[PDB]
Design a protein around this ligand. Structure first.
Ligand SMILES: CN(C)CCOc1ccc(C2=C(c3ccc(O)cc3)[C@@H]3C[C@@H](S(=O)(=O)Oc4ccc(Br)cc4)[C@H]2O3)cc1
Ligand SMILES: CN(C)CCOc1ccc(C2=C(c3ccc(O)cc3)[C@@H]3C[C@@H](S(=O)(=O)Oc4ccc(Br)cc4)[C@H]2O3)cc1
Lengths: 215, 227
């Protein structure tokens, strides 16, 4: 409701404020296992994601059932785009955590690793902005999982275009960049799908996410 | 040169390059079994793949790439391309999937529903044929582009993004010609491209269940391109 009256600037500021912190993996630096560190990290990241999602404009207007469905579909995509975003300044490496920086040598699992690296390289080449990044995350949340959702998605599109226009991009450059960003989301969906496979080759259930949202 | 075309030239090229609608095996044993229907769909897809290569080679910019890169794009995109074609054919048939004119099926059920929802989505958006062929070309060029390598490889990936930008210009031009406002233009462009992520999802789920007891090799795709 109120999310549909939000301006582009208000949408950006809201998403920037809802942004989760960068968490550390739990290991002792005084000491001389990887999948355990990632699992522990992803579990703590999940808690912050639920609170982030609740602060995404229009999301709370949805029924509790629809909120869970979106999170169930998007959670791995959200984690992955976050990883890719914070790894953007580290070519050839993935920054899972500030104290957990890995290259493909240490790295299902190499296939996904390379796809993650390629996305990070793509973001860096496009000079993806933080304001654009938070918009993409919100898009992933709302799109991966109907009328209200699509109105909000149109708002985020307006927000992206407004950001580009403010940055001095021409009208042609605006829709081109918009297209480039949204097409990357297809690769992110692909990575998540491949990712789920290897997670069933050893995940928050519907009830788990419902209980977290209620809290 | 694909980058020299105009929006109208691009549309005309894509429309002319459209593959034919094929028929599945005539008069199969009905009712179907799980095996017999998969046999029909497999035979149909195999014959469709032939015309897809012919189509792909006529997509502006595609033949400019090395044969190796062309195969890689097809490897990543072929199922997506088959599925969006299916979704397009099924638009005027609510609740049904038109795999072929002689194979219209109503309500692997999960993928069926995802395909129905995508078809209804295209129907609700009033997707145009001109828009459709643009989206299909985008899939071909984009689905495998994020997995390239040298200076030559840098030029290859760079060339693809330019053609992709060109198709974006073409989609926008179609929308502006239709009379849509600039706001409606950016919004509709976004809606169409977000659907491509769903098509990716259905393709991945499709690949999964295909490996589940039920894919064209590099050598096959390469040979057909050379043929
Ligand atoms: C109860 N549940 C919530 C438990 C979930 O536990 C999990 C959940 C996710 C993960 C993984 C990753 C991940 C975790 C947090 C994050 O901020 C970014 C990425 C990356 C992607 C996937 S993958 O396993 O799907 O892909 C990769 C595999 C190996 C490597 Br190296 C890189 C990626 C795997 O590595 C690991 C354990
Ligand atoms: C290249 N060759 C070596 C191998 C090709 O073999 C294949 C290739 C494709 C297919 C399938 C489909 C398909 C075929 C042609 C087409 O124009 C559109 C879709 C649909 C989607 C998938 S699915 O089996 O993954 O999804 C569905 C399942 C059931 C139903 Br009903 C509908 C979809 C399956 O049914 C089956 C066998």
């Amino acid at each position: 409701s109120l999310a549909l009256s939000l301006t582009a600037d208000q949408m950006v500021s809201a998403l920037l404020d809802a942004e989760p912190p960068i968490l550390y993996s739990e290991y002792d630096p005084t000491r001389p296992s990887m999948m355990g560190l990632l699992t522990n990290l992803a579990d703590r990241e999940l808690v912050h994601m639920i609170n982030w999602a609740k602060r995404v404009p229009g999301f709370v207007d949805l029924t509790s059932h629809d909120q869970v469905h979106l999170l169930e579909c998007a959670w791995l995509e959200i984690l992955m785009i976050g990883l890719v975003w914070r790894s953007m300044e580290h070519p050839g490496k993935l920054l899972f955590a500030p104290n957990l920086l890995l290259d493909r040598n240490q790295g299902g699992m190499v296939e996904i690793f390379d796809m993650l690296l390629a996305t990070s390289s793509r973001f860096r080449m496009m000079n993806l902005q933080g304001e654009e990044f938070v918009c993409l995350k919100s898009i992933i949340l709302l799109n991966s999982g109907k009328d209200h959702i699509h109105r909000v998605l149109d708002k985020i599109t307006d927000t992206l275009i407004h950001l580009m226009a403010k940055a001095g991009l021409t009208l042609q450059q605006q829709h081109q960049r918009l297209a480039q960003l949204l097409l990357i989301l297809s690769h992110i969906r692909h990575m998540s799908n491949k990712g789920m496979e290897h997670l069933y080759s050893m995940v928050p259930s519907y009830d788990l996410l419902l209980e977290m949202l209620d809290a």
